[PDB]
Symmetry: C2
Subunit: 196 residues, 2 copies
């Protein structure tokens, strides 16, 4: 019933950037956000991931974990304002990329009840689109019949810390195949308690 995300109105004023609230799906809460990252910040995250990863599935699963520097600290501070959870609960920015004919099957961001990580589980996600995708790559929620299309600098926030578990399961989401171009995203996954 109550959400972690606690922002009314049309903008979120962070210390260094005014974020636009574009659309909300109210329960489970999914929010499309504009002006989250500058174009330069998007390009820098992509550059850092290419440098960090210089036959696994890192690019499409766990993501390139960026080493802490001022850029990551700056962005993590901003997104802590958006998500209403301290950056100390975040896993840190992870960069994923999908080429033509790559996708991800619909899944939950939270860990399974049996899981090693389930004792301090994820509670919310921010997905930041780092580039424009020529065709495909939408983030889709199949139990809600909702999709969000990539747009450079925008993001989708969603949360899954409800007492009613069915609300958490409604956040099942996949990445539709890229059919032209490429898709780059950054994620911040945040835990219930502090992380590392």
């Amino acid at each position: 019933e109550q959400t972690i995300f606690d922002h009314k109105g049309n903008v979120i004023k962070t210390e260094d950037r005014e974020i636009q609230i574009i659309s909300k799906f109210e329960e489970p809460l999914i929010v499309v956000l504009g002006n989250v990252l500058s174009d330069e910040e998007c390009d820098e995250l992509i550059e850092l991931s290419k440098s960090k990863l210089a036959v696994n599935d890192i690019r499409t699963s766990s993501g390139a974990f960026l080493d802490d520097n001022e850029l990551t600290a700056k962005i993590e501070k901003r997104i802590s304002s958006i998500m209403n959870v301290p950056a100390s609960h975040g896993e840190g920015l992870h960069i994923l990329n999908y080429e033509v004919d790559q996708q991800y099957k619909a899944h939950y961001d939270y860990f399974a009840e049996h899981s090693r990580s389930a004792a301090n589980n994820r509670i919310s996600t921010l997905v930041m689109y780092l580039n424009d995708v020529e065709e495909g790559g939408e983030t889709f929620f199949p139990k809600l019949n909702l999709s969000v299309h990539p747009r450079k600098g925008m993001a989708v926030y969603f949360e899954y810390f409800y007492q009613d578990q069915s609300l958490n399961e409604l956040t099942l989401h996949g990445g539709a195949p890229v059919t032209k171009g490429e898709k780059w995203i950054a994620t911040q996954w945040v835990r219930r308690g502090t992380y590392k």
Copy 2:
């Protein structure tokens, strides 16, 4: 009920004069949030035109809207809109401008006419709402049966359609305008009919 009128796949709609962004889709009934629909200048011009048209207690501003006279600007915008909606501008009612001050809203309603209306014989099938300014606080377009809201953002738009065979899908397009609590909200609408209109 299965197919939609809106027929655009991918992430952009390339019109003759502007690339429109597809931001988000609620799939059925179809509601699409669109970016880059109107330039900043076009938004400001439409607001100015409506002020000119309206120049003693009638509710034109919050109901039917200022109907802009057909000129170069309205024809250009209506052509662009026709590409987005996949329905010729000849089916449109023409751009109507509405504005909401603090503590003004609209109760959730359907855009299509009721069965009893003379207008139901050539009913509305789809709507485009274009946000012409930024709204300091409030003013969201909300769909209460779907738990979806779209917040005003200058130059963006919300498209939705209600020409399904299953009437329950059309009824899910019930939508309202939440009160403005700070600033003011300006919108342009294009309502499209099944057949040609005037």
